[PDB]
Amino acid sequence: SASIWVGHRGTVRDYPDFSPSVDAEAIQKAIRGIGTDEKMLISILTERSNAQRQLIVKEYQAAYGKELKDDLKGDLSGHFEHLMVALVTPPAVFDAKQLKKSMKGAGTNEDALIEILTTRTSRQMKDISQAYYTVYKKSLGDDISSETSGDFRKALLTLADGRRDESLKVDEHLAKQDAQILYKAGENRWGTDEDKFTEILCLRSFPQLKLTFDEYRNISQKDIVDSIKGELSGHFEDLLLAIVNCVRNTPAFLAERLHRALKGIGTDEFTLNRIMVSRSEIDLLDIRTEFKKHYGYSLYSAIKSDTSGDYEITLLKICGGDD
């Protein structure tokens, strides 16, 4: 058992000298009474992996009959609070909540839905579905079904099932047939067979899709991206382009979401928090590399320019270093 939630390029790793008891006691002393030692909280939680944080949570419950997340919510405020609670939340539960949050109210955050459902693996998606049910007592699919529609809805429902092929094997025969199908379902006909785009881009493994995009280019003499932009529109178009970019370079896709979250008028702290926390033990190092390659400046400096206080320090600790 390797964590489906832990990858090879994260910025946060297991603290080797970890002691749950010592950490829980330190956290308790830090929030206990008037004031809060935010510095102590930062020092500990950003320097422990999520798995260790879960052990601290368990220990804190045992020793104080208190839920660590509730004490954090009672003492902390703002972005710093949200970030800190995010850090102590199990990964599948964090994603499930982010998903609920993106569908909550009169509006839907299509970009957040796209981001999460396209970057999570089938295994993580199965975990997220289970967590969603546990926390909401409703399936993710039911919620998606009700807050979206059209082709966008159908593609999100296919991804939420976590049925994408996980095999390591590829089928050149299959890649050619699929590339022919995509060609025939789009460019080669008036209108588009949207369902066929959804089926192939959502159920074939990433490796398989990379072959299919090569064959497609051969058949059509155009990139799959060109076809998608010409045949589709709206959120559906955005979702399929997201799938293509993730197949080719997931860290660059996420580097781009971070970039938009930090630029313009007003930082999108929720996108920032989500990406920083959820990819910290997976590929934040690669996201850093891509961000710098694409924008010319490191993620570390982007954080430093648009954020401040304890919130900034925590993000910088998660970030891990400059590039």
Binding mask 110-149 for Ca ion (x = CB under 5 A): -------------------------------------x--
Q: What is the Cα–Cα distance from 161 to 126, expressed in whole angstroms?
A: 7
Q: What is the Cα–Cα distance from 51 to 91, expressed in whole angstroms?
A: 9
Torsion angle, alpha carbons of 183, 188, 192, 193, to 10: -50
Binding mask 88-107 for Ca ion (x = CB under 5 A): ---------------x-x--
Nearer to Ca ion, 154 or 288 (CB): 154
Structure tokens at 132: 């969603």
Percent of the chain that is helix, strand, coil (3-state, to 5) = 70, 0, 30
> What residues contact 127, with CB distance under 8 A and at least 6 apart?
4, 5, 91, 92
CA 91 centroid distance within chain: 10
Nearer to Ca ion, 234 or 309 (CB): 234
C-alpha dist (Å) from residue 96 to 39, 82, 140, 291: 29, 15, 8, 26
What is the residue whose two structure tokens read 């206990």?
32
Nearer to Ca ion, 9 or 217 (CB): 217
Nearer to Ca ion, 95 or 231 (CB): 231
Nearer to Ca ion, 241 or 258 (CB): 241
Residue 154 CB, shortest distance to Ca ion, in Å, is: 12
What is the residue whose two structure tokens read 């209108």?
191
Stretch of residues binding Ca ion (CB under 5 A), selected from 23-31, 37-45, 130-138, 261-269: 23-31
Residue 196 CB, shortest distance to Ca ion, in Å, is: 9
Stretch of residues binding Ca ion (CB under 5 A), selected from 27-35, 60-68, 111-119, 207-215: 27-35
Binding mask 257-276 for Ca ion (x = CB under 5 A): --------------------
Residue 245 CB, shortest distance to Ca ion, in Å, is: 15
Stretch of residues binding Ca ion (CB under 5 A), selected from 187-195, 245-253, 254-262, 267-275: 187-195
Residue 89 CB, shortest distance to Ca ion, in Å, is: 21
* Positions 68 through 87 that interact with Ca ion (CB under 5 A): 75
Question: Is 41 within 8 Å of 84 (Cβ atoms)?
Answer: yes
Residue 121 CB, shortest distance to Ca ion, in Å, is: 26
- Left (φ > 0), alpha (ψ -120 to 50) or beta: where does 234 sit? left
Binding site for Ca ion (CB under 5 A): 31, 36, 75, 103, 105, 108, 147, 186, 191-192, 229, 231, 233, 237
